Design a protein around this ligand. Structure first.
Ligand SMILES: [Mg+2]
Ligand code: NA
Length: 287
């Protein structure tokens, strides 16, 4: 991968995605600990706190011999907010990279545009590249290859689905999407992934290698009636099929404890893989 930043997979081809995935796999197998990033610091610019992401990135930097400094931007109100360019021009003088969690993707795009150092989108309303990488490593580990895998997404057409759809054609995934009416993902992402779309969760899941869901986002809950990925829906997958879920889970809503901790679940390997892929990304952009 050669873009300076990782806001999504815009400038990535299949070879570049594979390299990142190959590196993550190698780092995991080696339980890698090193000093590749010694003397380097990653700024965590979170507009909204995220314990899970903070943990992943702080641990990732420490494993590579560097550090992550936490910048709780929520502490600065709109009445005291600095233009994004000022934030970028100041940080670039102190850190080697910026990992941002923003409310609006436009913000991280602006941060990357104005900063000379690498900017990683830890999470935005439009995309979640880091999650997608962890999801692919997980699928790769489970099935031995990604090309031809049939992955069914049942739920909201959100940032996670967007990135899954974007990497889909780069890895040869056969995605099937099921969302309630009005909660669908952009037509373009779907067509470019040549994804199957339907409003019926059963149709999307039938015979799939994996069922993937995540939190939804009384009216909302009513619209998602029947989209819960429970033990029964998991029975529609092929025998070797598995269950994935970003976490945390809203039990009783998009899934159940049985599903998350059941024999088909790979949820926690999926979680762990966020560490290995973050290390791969950080080493690649910051070394
Ligand atoms: Mg603190
Ligand atoms: Na240290």
């Amino acid at each position: 991968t050669l873009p300076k930043d990782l806001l999504d997979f815009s400038g990535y081809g299949p070879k570049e995605l594979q390299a990142l995935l190959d590196l993550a796999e190698q780092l995991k197998r080696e339980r890698y600990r090193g000093e590749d990033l010694k003397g380097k610091v990653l700024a965590l610019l979170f507009e909204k706190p995220s314990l899970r992401t903070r943990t992943t990135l702080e641990v990732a930097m420490v494993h590579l011999g560097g550090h992550a400094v936490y910048l709780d931007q929520k502490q600065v109100g709109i009445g005291e907010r600095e233009p994004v360019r000022d934030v970028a021009k100041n940080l670039e003088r102190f850190v080697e990279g910026i990992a941002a969690r923003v409310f609006r993707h436009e913000t991280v795009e602006a941060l990357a545009r104005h900063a000379k150092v690498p900017v990683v989108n830890a999470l935005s309303d439009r995309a979640h590249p880091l999650q997608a990488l962890a999801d692919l490593l997980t699928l790769k580990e489970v099935f031995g290859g990604l090309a031809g895998l049939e992955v069914a997404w049942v739920g909201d057409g959100n940032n996670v689905l967007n990135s899954l759809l974007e990497v889909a054609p780069l890895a040869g995934l056969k995605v099937r999407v099921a969302t309630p009416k009005g909660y669908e993902p952009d037509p373009g992402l779907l067509k470019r992934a040549n994804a199957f779309f339907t409003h019926d969760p059963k149709e999307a899941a039938l015979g799939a290698h994996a069922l993937y869901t995540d939190v939804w986002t009384e009216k909302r809950l009513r619209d998602f009636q029947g989209f819960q990925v429970n033990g029964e829906l998991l029975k529609l997958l092929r025998p070797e099929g598995v269950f994935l879920h970003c976490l945390p889970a809203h039990y009783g809503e998009e899934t159940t404890e049985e599903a998350v901790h059941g024999p088909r679940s790979r949820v926690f390997d999926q979680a762990e893989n966020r560490l290995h892929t973050a290390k791969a990304v950080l080493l690649t952009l910051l070394k």
